[PDB]
Design a protein around this nucleic acid. Structure first.
Ligand SMILES: [Mg+2]
Ligand SMILES: [Mg+2]
Ligand SMILES: [Mg+2]
Ligand SMILES: [Mg+2]
Ligand SMILES: [Mg+2]
Ligand SMILES: [Mg+2]
Ligand SMILES: [Mg+2]
Ligand SMILES: [Mg+2]
Ligand SMILES: [Mg+2]
Ligand SMILES: [Mg+2]
Lengths: 117, 321, 392, 215, 45
RNA sequence: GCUAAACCUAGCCCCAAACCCCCACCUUACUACCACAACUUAGCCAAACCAUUUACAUAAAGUAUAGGCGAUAGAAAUUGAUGG
RNA sequence: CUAUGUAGCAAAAUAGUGGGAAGAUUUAUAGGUAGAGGCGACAAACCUACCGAGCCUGGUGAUAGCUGGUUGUCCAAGAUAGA
RNA sequence: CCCAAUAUCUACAAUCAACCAACAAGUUAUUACCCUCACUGUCAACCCAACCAGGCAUGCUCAUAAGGAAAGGUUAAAAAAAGUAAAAGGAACUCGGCAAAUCUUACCCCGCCUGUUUACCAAAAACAUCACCUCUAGCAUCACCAGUAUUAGAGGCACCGCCUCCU
């Protein structure tokens, strides 16, 4: 008889209490007899770098020059990414300069996103 | 009542089970059988071929438990010459062992019973893989008042913080058969660890001085349960402490690595009132864990060891003199 | 009268949209917008095939296209099957004659007292009890748990007879026994895949129990026939099988020669428990299968009369009734309905104990049948250990 | 109402199947027939009525021998498990059928009437005039629908070109093609009339309940 | 004695007044839409 | 003397003009992940009951016409169209 | 059946006395039957405390020859044939 | 919180399950897979009755090892409520032996019996009920029914036997 409070896993009878998750991802599947099989591939392996010798810290000194907000736009990226190669080669049929026409044969597809932050 | 589980994943559960048991632990000690043992090993591992392919989650239920069944059955069958006790014995396969006792008091921390003092009950249920029960008691290892410099480790924190959970079901003392069974005393127990606790699962874990912890915990818990049940089958209990030491032996194995334990119960007075000053301690006398062999490649067993089999037969040769 | 009411079948697919049957038209279906809409035409999609095939959703190709598929219909007898007519059906299937009563030779291997185990009678009585009254934490144990222990510790009780002769410690008890024996009978390609347990083997195979002049004295006997029942009723008629005999293991085994087969109808509910006749028939077929597997291993798949007959034993039991069988195979030649037959001695309806009371019976506090077994007959145990001792 | 009727089995087998009672409720959910509900749980044995059914890839008249003649909750008569060839079937048995008997099932119309044992199945034409029959069928190759109840005798009255007139237990006649297969005899469980059920509890056990109304 | 006609049960409450039961019939969608219009923040039980 | 009594605006009403707007969610909604379908207003109410019947720009006109010719119903041809 | 209680502990309870208590019994759990309809061992009994016809919203400001009301000052004319 | 597919099977109860006795009749062979413990409930003096001598399924303890407090202080008026005791008499009370105390007997009317009913003034002599009788119906896959005239539905009646002046 309470309908305003959120509905979460702590609410129903045994069945409900079990079925309803809590926002937590899955990593495996139930086999016969309520046995759980975990898959090493569906567990996010963190990728932490080697921080030794790094010359940057959580904050930046107050003695730094200011600048203008210039968000990176497709034109700005293209300008210094591939354009100079074109111009250099313009003085004497697009995949040679980084163009990727289709995105089935690469591990990190850009659309749809098949990878994670 | 707390549900103590002899085969436990919990870290350093051995010393916690010491506290719940008033048990000290001492490191040390108080023929073609190799052919037949290796033949049973092969006829369960490689020789005898299954119909349905082996999966590595029931491998500790259909290619390692029949191994212990065959080992114990053959050794008992052929060793009856050297020990008439085994002849008219009682061999039990997966028979239940239950013990129920009280040790300590706590003040209920919440509810309509706060402050009021209540006992800290425990309960051990155990399905030992194989066990051998006799009709005449074994010979105690060391007398009933064996004072030792080592002292029972003290756990100051609550029992729950080591993963250990309460519940309420029937209370059961049980050695393997009811009171009327003449073979009420107990000789030996062979345990097989599930795969959860096996070597490889804790090898993905990266510590070495924790592998023996599960062995010791299984030994302490299960042997204390068995010995205590034997005692309380004779009329003894906490407020009438046992007069003669009770004793039993256990072999704990994961299928490849073996360990042996020689437990001797001296005291059942573990309540806070009956443990007021009783200086009796229970003792364990376990060893480390050694490898029976190295591998099973095609049909041989390279590196098959005889020390472990010799120790097994040694433990099976004991007599009730 | 067809079976299956109309209102439970899948469905008649909805009438197709007529736009499809206009020859030049390509309809407008809701496949463009990936979701159903009730005011367009239901598409027709290609049959979808998974480039991979996940194990959790595999679908096996039909029974026809399996690599091991034979046109001729085999008739397997695997554990669950239950012969209708029972004993005589197994006889026909095996071409044998049932000689009532155990052979005199084995029954004369126990009359001498020196083959006595210590305190035999009271120890078998307390073993009966230990299996049936003190086994688990509840007052009345059930068959699923007390059928196996009776046997598995009666054999242990008798196994303490090594002191008299150290040639007894020369055999083992094995579990998980899977022996497959295929043979033929009147162009019916029969097979027996016995997947059971409680078998014991030995190094020295058992001796022949009938004289060479008695195995030939069976030709006069006419193998019994039943009509109109076929000799294959209740057999599993399968088109998936193999022409291949396997004893359940491979080369190079200590204790390779079977001795006895213990069969345990341990189901708690009666309808899952084979009747007496079915149980004896199961014993006969399993024993014949083990014997035929041994014969194939020794000689080969050649129909012939064996010079050295292979004998096996079997005890079938539920926990209070026992059936004992000695089966002597002497012929791999079985296609013909005449010739030398195999021999089978069977003793049936042998009660180890008439009844058991787990809790005292009280009419008016005048207890009449106190706790324990009522009507114990040690003769069943006599025959049991007799069958055990033979072959020493 | 989500009411999938239990009678969903397609394959035939002698094993009892799990009845679900209706209580008078049809698929909608309303009391369609008053006076039904409750009573002992029951299982259903798929009694096969086409008593001339030859096994797979066989033909010609066949003999089958009975095994047991047991009570059946659903029927009023007593079913019997007949084995033949490589097949077991549940068939309604007649009065004097004991375990072990044998019965013939034929479609072969002889030159003249063949004296038929009191349990065999023969085409109507094959029988003589004045006998008693059960498990009659309206038209050939259809199944037995007429006389099946407990203790009911159906007399054969006459035969004419291609047809036969039989008398149903309700004291009236009907025509049927002479190739319709019936069984000669009287359906089992005679004197089932004289079952004084004694007390209302027995009616409740059977499945009936007392219902006022029935508008 | 009366007054205790509500014997609570989460299964029943979610089965006979829940989102899916409303959305399983035109009348229920009308109910949800009425309660969307009136402003409610408890559309379905 | 307590209790009180007093207040302004927060907003709103009617017009005019202009056509208005990261994740999860139909299973037990807010849950990462497996083989059917949609397409005539009756009647309260008047006739003092009730049964046919009973309403949903200006002018022509409440005219023609309909109607237990009762209660009532009712055209067309043509005419011309930011504020309180 | 009696007594207490009658805004009561309770919008039908309490105390005693009683009928059944292996059965046509009692009961937890999910589903079904929906309003001129359901269900009913027929009592017009029951369908969320109030059922000879649930409840809510709408037509609805239903209609009411019936009941009740109808608000500042002062003056003046003003009553009992009948169809 | 579950289960890879296909075919095969799957006749005999449960009652200490054995004696008698009954009726209400109660999974595997092939093909595919060598993967491991994730996720959620876990509190309390609690829930439905507006706050409550009421309602609340199961296991175990059967008088308690667990749980609680009938008197805010006083005095001991009437009327009221519950209880205990009572001389002699023992229904003369009263509509009636209601209540209480004691435990026995006999008959008569109605209904055959056990049961069900007016949740909240009627538990009955009413309803139902075995037994009997009457009426209708010759038969397929959604009820009756996976039924077939000794069956099914709808009605009346109510086993069975026998008839249509004392007080
Ligand atoms: Mg009017
Ligand atoms: Mg008004
Ligand atoms: Mg008037
Ligand atoms: Mg005046
Ligand atoms: Mg808890
Ligand atoms: Mg207390
Ligand atoms: Mg108080
Ligand atoms: Mg007071
Ligand atoms: Mg007096
Ligand atoms: Mg009564």
């Amino acid at each position: 008889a309470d309908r305003m409070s959120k509905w979460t896993s702590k609410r129903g009878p045994r069945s409900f209490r079990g079925r309803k998750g809590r926002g937590a991802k899955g990593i495996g599947f139930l086999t016969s007899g309520w046995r759980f099989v975990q898959i090493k591939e569906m567990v996010p392996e963190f990728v932490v770098p080697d921080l030794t010798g790094f010359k940057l810290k959580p904050y930046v000194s107050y003695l730094a020059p200011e600048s203008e907000e210039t968000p990176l736009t497709a034109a700005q990226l293209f300008s210094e990414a591939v354009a100079p190669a074109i111009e250099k080669d313009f003085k004497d049929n697009l995949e040679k300069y980084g163009f990727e026409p289709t995105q089935e044969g690469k591990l990190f597809q850009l659309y749809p996103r098949n990878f994670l932050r | 009542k707390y549900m103590v589980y002899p085969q436990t994943f919990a870290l350093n559960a051995d010393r916690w089970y010491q506290y719940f048991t008033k048990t000290v632990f001492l490191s040390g000690l108080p023929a073609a059988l190799r052919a037949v043992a290796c033949d049973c090993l092969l006829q369960e591992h490689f020789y005898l071929r299954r119909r349905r392919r082996v999966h590595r989650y029931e491998e500790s239920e259909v290619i390692s438990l029949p191994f212990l069944d065959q080992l114990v059955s053959t050794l008992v069958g052929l060793l009856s010459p050297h020990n008439p006790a085994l002849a008219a014995a009682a061999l039990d396969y997966r028979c239940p062992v239950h013990f129920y006792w009280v040790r300590g008091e706590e003040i209920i921390p919440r509810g309509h019973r706060r402050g009021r003092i209540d006992d800290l009950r425990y309960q051990i249920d155990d399905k030992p893989n194989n066990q051998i029960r006799i009709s005449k008691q074994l010979a105690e290892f060391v007398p009933l008042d064996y004072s030792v410099p080592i002292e029972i480790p003290t756990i100051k924190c609550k029992p729950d913080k080591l993963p250990l959970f309460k519940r309420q079901y029937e209370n059961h003392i049980f050695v393997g058969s009811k009171t009327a069974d003449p073979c009420c005393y107990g000789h030996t127990q062979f345990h097989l660890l599930p795969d959860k606790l096996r070597r490889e699962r804790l090898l993905r874990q990266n510590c070495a001085d924790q592998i023996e912890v599960v062995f010791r915990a299984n030994a302490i818990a299960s042997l204390f349960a068995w010995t205590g049940a034997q005692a309380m089958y004779q009329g003894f209990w906490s407020e009438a402490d046992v007069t003669r030491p009770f004793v039993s032996q256990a072999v704990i194995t994961d299928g490849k690595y073996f360990s042996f334990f020689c437990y001797q119960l001296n005291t059942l007075a573990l309540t806070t009132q009956a443990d007021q000053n009783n200086p009796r301690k229970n003792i364990c006398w376990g060893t480390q864990s050694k490898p029976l062999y190295e591998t099973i490649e095609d049909n041989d067993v390279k590196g098959f060891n005889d020390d472990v089999l010799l120790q097994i037969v040694h433990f099976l040769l004991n007599r009730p003199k | 009268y067809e079976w299956g009411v109309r209102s439970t079948r899948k469905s008649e697919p909805p009438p197709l949209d007529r736009v499809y049957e206009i020859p030049g038209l390509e309809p407008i279906t809701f496949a463009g917008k990936m979701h159903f809409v009730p005011w367009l035409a239901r598409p027709i999609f290609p049959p979808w095939d998974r480039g991979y095939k996940d194990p959790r959703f595999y679908r096996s190709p039909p029974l026809h296209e399996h690599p091991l598929y034979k046109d001729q219909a085999c008739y397997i007898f695997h554990h669950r099957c239950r012969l209708l007519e029972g004993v005589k059906q197994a006889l026909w299937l095996t071409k044998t004659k049932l000689i009532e009563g155990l052979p005199e030779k084995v029954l004369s291997l126990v009359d001498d007292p020196r083959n006595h185990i210590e305190n035999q009678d009271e120890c078998v009585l307390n073993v009966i009890s230990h299996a049936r009254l003190w086994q688990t934490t509840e007052e009345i144990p059930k068959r699923e748990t007390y059928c196996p222990v009776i046997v598995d510790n009666l054999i242990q009780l008798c196994k303490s007879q090594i002191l008299k002769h150290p040639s007894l410690a020369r055999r083992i008890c094995v579990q998980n026994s899977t022996f497959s024996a295929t043979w033929n009978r009147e162009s019916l390609l029969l097979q027996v895949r016995g997947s059971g347990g409680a078998r014991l083997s030995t190094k020295d195979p058992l001796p022949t129990i009938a004289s060479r002049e008695e195995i030939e004295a069976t030709k006069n006997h006419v193998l019994e026939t039943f009509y109109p029942i076929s000799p294959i009723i209740d057999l599993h008629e399968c088109n998936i099988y193999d022409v291949k005999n396997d004893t359940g293991f491979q080369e190079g085994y200590p204790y390779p020669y079977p001795h006895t087969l213990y069969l345990l109808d341990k189901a708690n509910l009666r309808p899952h428990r084979l009747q007496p006749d079915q149980l004896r028939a199961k014993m006969i077929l399993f024993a014949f299968g083990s014997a035929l597997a041994q014969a194939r291993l020794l000689y080969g798949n050649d129909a012939k009369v064996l010079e050295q007959p292979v004998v096996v034993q079997s005890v079938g039991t539920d926990g209070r009734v026992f059936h004992f069988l000695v089966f002597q195979l002497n012929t791999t030649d079985l296609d013909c309905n005449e010739g030398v037959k195999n021999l089978a001695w069977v003793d049936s309806d042998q009660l180890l104990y008439q009844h058991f009371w787990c809790l005292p019976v009280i009419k008016k506090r005048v207890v009449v049948e106190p706790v324990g077994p009522v009507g114990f007959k040690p003769e069943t145990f006599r025959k049991f250990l007799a069958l055990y001792l033979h072959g020493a | 109402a989500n009411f999938v009727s239990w009678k969903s089995r397609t394959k035939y087998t002698i094993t009892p199947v799990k009845m679900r009672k209706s209580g008078g409720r049809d698929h909608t959910g309303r009391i369609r027939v008053h006076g039904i509900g409750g009573g002992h749980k029951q299982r259903y044995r798929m009694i096969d009525f086409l008593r001339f059914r030859p096994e797979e890839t066989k033909s010609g008249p066949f003999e089958e021998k009975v095994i047991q003649v047991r009570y059946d909750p659903c029927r009023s008569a007593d079913i019997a498990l007949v084995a033949g060839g490589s097949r077991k079937r549940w068939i309604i048995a007649t009065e004097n059928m004991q375990a072990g008997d044998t019965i013939l099932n034929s479609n072969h119309i002889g030159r003249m009437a063949v004296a038929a044992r009191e349990g065999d199945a023969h085409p109507l034409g094959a029988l003589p005039v004045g006998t008693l029959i059960n498990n009659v069928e309206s038209e050939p190759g259809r199944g037995a629908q007429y006389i099946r109840a407990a203790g009911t005798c159906g007399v054969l009255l006459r035969k004419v070109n291609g047809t036969a007139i039989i008398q149903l237990p309700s004291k009236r006649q009907m025509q049927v093609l002479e190739t319709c297969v019936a069984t000669v005899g009287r359906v089992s469980n005679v004197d089932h009339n004289k079952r004084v059920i004694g007390k209302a509890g027995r009616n409740r056990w059977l499945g009936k309940r007392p219902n006022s109304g029935r508008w | 004695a009366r007054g205790n006609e509500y014997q609570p049960s989460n299964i029943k409450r979610k089965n006979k007044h829940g989102w899916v039961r409303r959305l399983s019939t035109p009348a229920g969608v009308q109910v949800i839409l009425r309660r969307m219009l009136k402003g409610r923040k408890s559309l379905s039980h």
